[PDB]
Design a protein around this motif. Structure first.
Motif, PDB file in Angstrom:
ATOM      1  N   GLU A  16     -12.867  39.678  12.833  1.00 43.51           N
ATOM      2  CA  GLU A  16     -12.370  40.478  12.398  1.00 43.51           C
ATOM      3  C   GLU A  16     -13.833  40.693  11.843  1.00 43.51           C
ATOM      4  O   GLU A  16     -14.367  41.994  11.319  1.00 43.51           O
ATOM      5  CB  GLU A  16     -11.569  40.755  10.907  1.00 43.51           C
ATOM      6  N   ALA A  20     -15.939  44.529  11.930  1.00 43.88           N
ATOM      7  CA  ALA A  20     -16.818  45.054  10.564  1.00 43.88           C
ATOM      8  C   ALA A  20     -17.988  45.053  10.537  1.00 43.88           C
ATOM      9  O   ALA A  20     -18.967  45.889  10.076  1.00 43.88           O
ATOM     10  CB  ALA A  20     -15.944  44.500   9.327  1.00 43.88           C
ATOM     11  N   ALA A  24     -20.502  48.427  10.420  1.00 40.16           N
ATOM     12  CA  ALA A  24     -20.779  48.624   9.568  1.00 40.16           C
ATOM     13  C   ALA A  24     -22.802  48.980  10.089  1.00 40.16           C
ATOM     14  O   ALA A  24     -23.193  49.766   8.956  1.00 40.16           O
ATOM     15  CB  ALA A  24     -21.008  47.395   8.697  1.00 40.16           C
ATOM     16  N   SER A  57     -20.221  43.971   4.729  1.00 42.65           N
ATOM     17  CA  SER A  57     -18.902  44.907   5.043  1.00 42.65           C
ATOM     18  C   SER A  57     -17.907  43.866   6.176  1.00 42.65           C
ATOM     19  O   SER A  57     -16.474  43.847   5.609  1.00 42.65           O
ATOM     20  CB  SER A  57     -19.511  45.727   6.373  1.00 42.65           C
ATOM     21  N   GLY A  58     -18.924  42.847   6.331  1.00 43.45           N
ATOM     22  CA  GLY A  58     -17.943  41.376   7.641  1.00 43.45           C
ATOM     23  C   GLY A  58     -17.326  41.118   5.924  1.00 43.45           C
ATOM     24  O   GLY A  58     -15.908  40.308   7.053  1.00 43.45           O
ATOM     25  N   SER A  61     -14.377  42.502   4.859  1.00 45.24           N
ATOM     26  CA  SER A  61     -13.421  43.435   5.992  1.00 45.24           C
ATOM     27  C   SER A  61     -12.728  42.057   5.958  1.00 45.24           C
ATOM     28  O   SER A  61     -11.212  41.528   6.286  1.00 45.24           O
ATOM     29  CB  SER A  61     -13.767  43.786   6.682  1.00 45.24           C
TER      30      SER A  61
END
Lengths: 90, 90, 90, 91, 90, 90
Positions: A16, A20, A24, A57-58, A61
């Protein structure tokens, strides 16, 4: 190229985080590492602005579904740590 | 195709999760991963409706005999994430 | 054929589980798996009646000398989880 | 050549330690080891002054983002421990 | 032939268990297994009297310097668990 | 030849134990093993007097920077445990 790193507990959180990161910003997934005790790392490369946006962003998420243990942006990796990165090439 | 992931503590819970996923919907088991600390992941692919039904059922069945650590549906995996998925091809 | 699974903490408890499973009923040891954190799994195949008797006995015998983490009988495994079982063929 | 070692919890903390070591002084990353329970080690070689400066800086930088479990400078490694170092050679 | 098993936390305790087993009775060291989380197993074969004497002595000596997690004597191993034993041949 | 063993938590503590052993007496480093959960072992051989001096010093030096989990001198190893030692040859 700048390096972005996210280490999570478990493979699903790492996938995940990786998904992400690539969504992004214009970064490429170039490294994947598992060092045991469930610690799984995804590594991306790109311009430093893209890597910073990607890792932010990673992390957000991956934290929604699992534990993020560590994250890091290295704007200009010294040439020797590319030995470690290439050790985890995918 | 969408990706469904279930990570469990232990191999037996993961096999039960995989069995329940494939029984519940038209998904294919395409990945299997073990990253240590007992964390074992099953990965399925299919249409997002089938994958969602599969992961819901797999989590419900695996939780009966063991610990589900995390689960995830990615409706549209970015092309780079298939590098990690194919790393765990079976 | 039905699948019987016993996961133990440690190899010795698993060997005891396997020995008691094969003594208890007409089942064949076809899988052996180690996924770290000390989790060791033995897999047997046979008719569902034999597998159920085998797993009951293996769990009872293994619990006297060690920890049984999980056990499972799948009367009719989906064809896809044989990919995982064959991954651990012995 | 002197040997510098930093052991961290996790790969990312170790990469940061290695980056900081190689930035801080004239040392070369020559070894990389993972022994489970998440313990990851970076090994550098150089003159004892450079190795000491490198390990001090690598420890400080890695501690900002993760756990440093142990660190060490060996000014004159005995010829036998290079058997272990060569076991963890990285290129 | 009877099978004797000692599982310890750590390699040094296991070596001491193996040394004490082979010193104590006419048994042969035929198996060595490491399944992670520090669990290390030594396996010996011989007549049931010798194996019982060996495992008793190995457990007592290993317990002096470390943790013995499990020990076991199987007087007549079923033919299938030799699949596992041979998997750990040394 | 006598066998000296030091098991530590982590690779760095083990390297220090190994360095201190070889500095302290006329012993040769012949074995290196890690069995997970961070347990790392160094093995030396020499006369029993040298090995004892080596292990004492290796333990004292490694304890300065890390945890020594186990240590042992075997003055006359049984022929069979050299199967385990040679498994960890370096």
């Amino acid at each position: 190229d700048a390096l972005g790193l996210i280490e999570t507990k478990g493979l699903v959180a790492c996938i995940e985080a990786a998904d992400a990161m690539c969504a992004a910003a214009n970064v490429e997934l170039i490294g994947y590492g598992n060092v045991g005790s469930g610690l799984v790392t995804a590594m991306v490369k790109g311009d430093v602005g893209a890597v910073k946006a990607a890792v932010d962003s990673g992390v957000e998420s991956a934290q929604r579904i699992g534990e993020v243990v560590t994250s890091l942006v290295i704007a200009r990796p010294h040439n020797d740590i590319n030995k470690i990165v290439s050790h985890y090439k995918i």
